[PDB]
Write a protein that binds this ligand. Sequence first.
Ligand SMILES: [Mg+2]
Ligand SMILES: [Mg+2]
Ligand SMILES: [Mg+2]
Length: 105
Amino acid sequence: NLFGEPDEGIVISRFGMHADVESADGDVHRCNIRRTIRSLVTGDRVVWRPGKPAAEGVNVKGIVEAVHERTSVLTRPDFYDGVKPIAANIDQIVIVSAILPELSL
RNA sequence: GAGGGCGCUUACCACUUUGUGAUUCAUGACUGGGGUGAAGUCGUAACAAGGUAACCGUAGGGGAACCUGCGGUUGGAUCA
Ligand SMILES: [Mg+2]
Ligand SMILES: [Mg+2]
Ligand SMILES: [Mg+2]
């Protein structure tokens, strides 16, 4: 409760119980997520509110309320896990490989 | 004179000092795990004969669940 300003920002990473949310200028600010969110991936623009600082200048987390629509999505299914999206909202993929340990085709 | 007092000295001895142990708390860089986490990643181990029967003890291997070797058990299916 006691949430802040609704704004648009880019989610840095995913940690299950919470996520790292970059603001509109480059501020690393970790936030937890809303219970009704079906999925949240790396680099997905969201609507979020950065809580409220209990101490003056010292805040713990905010919340991520809503998730914007997906431009692209990287969904890969799995045995006994179902279809899980990995990342979203991307224009280019770079397949990176190495000769060691193997280079398959 | 007898005797007493003062004073001095000795014995006992608190406090105190050094050397060096035992014990306890606070702090402590660092470090060992373990627990709590519904949606994160990695895999599919076990529960059916769970797709190499599983488990216990021990040795070795490797991100990991685990795997191999030896021995034992049925808390194993199917089997005469
Ligand atoms: Mg298995
Ligand atoms: Mg098995
Ligand atoms: Mg055996």
